[PDB]
Amino acid sequence: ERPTLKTIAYMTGLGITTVSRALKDAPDIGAETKERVRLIAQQIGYQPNRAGVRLRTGKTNVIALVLSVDEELMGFTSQMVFGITEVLATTQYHLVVTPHTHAKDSMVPIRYILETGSADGVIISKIEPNDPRVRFMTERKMPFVTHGRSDMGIEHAYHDFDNEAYAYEAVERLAQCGRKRIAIIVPPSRFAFHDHARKGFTRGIRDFGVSEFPLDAITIETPLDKIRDFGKRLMQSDDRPDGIVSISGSSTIALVAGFEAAGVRIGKDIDIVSKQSAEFLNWIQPQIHTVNEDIKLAGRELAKALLARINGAPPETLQSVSRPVWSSMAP
Amino acid sequence: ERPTLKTIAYMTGLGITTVSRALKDAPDIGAETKERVRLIAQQIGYQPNRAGVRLRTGKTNVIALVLSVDEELMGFTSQMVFGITEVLATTQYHLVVTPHTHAKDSMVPIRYILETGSADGVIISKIEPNDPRVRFMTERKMPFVTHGRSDMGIEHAYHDFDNEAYAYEAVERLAQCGRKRIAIIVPPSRFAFHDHARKGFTRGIRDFGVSEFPLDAITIETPLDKIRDFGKRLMQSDDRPDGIVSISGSSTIALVAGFEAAGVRIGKDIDIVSKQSAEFLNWIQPQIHTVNEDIKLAGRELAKALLARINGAPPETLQSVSRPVWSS
DNA sequence: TATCTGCAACGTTGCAGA
DNA sequence: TATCTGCAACGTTGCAGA
User: Which segments constitute the HTH lacI-type domain (chain B) (predicted)?
Assistant: First the structure.
């Protein structure tokens, strides 16, 4: 009962080839014949059998999203998926998820994809300054887009958050509060935005004329129980920071836990600026000055890039950077 | 130059059918040619064309996960995905995702799958007492599994959290907390576990002999921007309940926000027990009494159930219910 | 017997004609 | 010329035959 090109050709009494050539934009076929086929196609509900189109022509009509299984607790990764799927909804693409179970495994799904040819484009995250997957797919000619930017001299489609702007805008608000010494929970040295964050913070500390409390012992992906204990004894030592800037809201939740374990009130004792992947943090402590990283917006703009790239628009167009916006609920 | 059965057959040089039949361990092909075919196959190293197979046989080797586009903010839906994929990683299945965005559009994706025959199994959530998707796939002989249970008299593979057990246990510890008035946050009467929650909870209050504050005014699906004032307006009242139970940590977060604006100290005045899809609430509130629903645990056995049903195992083997745990 | 083998076909499209 | 169309093949397996 499912309609096929054969099924259409029979009713029309046309040639299967005519139908195939009719459904697709072609000068070869006649206007009336075309419109006949485009109309009958719409009425019966004909959707091309994919396995058939994939067997003959390379087209997989599949977009692969690769995910590291270890993720930020509050990374609301699900929002990214919905951003993409919303975009893909108009088109013939399907979204497959292919995760890897550690940074050690980071190239294995990508070689899988290129080797079996099971995708028309790939979406990747956790970009490093010199990232091998970026070079692998560019040199193997695979359309892709990255959540993050790269410092390797390759122009590729991407959308990132302007964390350089974020850090610079982050302490200006701490300066506005009057806070004189600031610490940053910087991201891992391996990832690209680490240096993005540190640039904004370094120019931020310079231009606002405020001193910078430093911390080298901990990073965002350092464990949350461990962040809790660390957070507690700063405030216990004679020198405590006046300001705190966090790049991840999940690491953020563990830092406050130690502070009130230490027994300090935010707002009055220390004020915190933090990024959030969904607006949730002011419910628990509205004191926190929050910036929203709209990630399903990232989800939607990653999708739009990769599609344009699958068509064949050049990479330098397809690049985009999200600017910080300051949360509804923040002071 | 990607190797195909023809490529192997050319090299060996055997018959394509011999090559195919060797790799599927078959009785026809002789022991020595099989290790020849399997040794060369591994070395080059051959992957069957998914398209070539899918066109030739019905099997699509794809699992469709259907997701409500609107989900509780703290649903850690991402955890479930990983739970699912862990199971499929050993297998030949891929996981494709299929979303809808309107409640009426509840079944639009489901027929897309059937209409297209673009999946070997399907996963769905947000189950209703008589849900149209559940019998639709049951009558179309389409293998599927649900996150939740259904009251339509149809037996199907599922995995749910024992909310009836949880609700009864919620009332026990509020007795332990000493609180004499109890409130219950329930899902919309739209959903099935709504009665599961209220049955365990109302049975709980009879046995613990302590009474339930009514609070029929709000449900979990009420905006967190609205459940707020309710929170502040309730404790800012002539009578405040001594104990409160939440089914959603997403609603737990907003209600306490109202509680602290009005100024009630949790722990001392009011004690709260709440459901959790991942351990995040005691980082946020150390005194709140937390129970963990491991959702990627849900994810793996929804996966494990659906596989069994696709091979054709009977539906009732496939049913599972997780008992609640009170955390670390 | 053991052990191998071609044909035919799923739905689509490129190419060479009608 | 201007539209139309059959043949073949993409890779795979069930099947009969040897």
Answer: 3-57
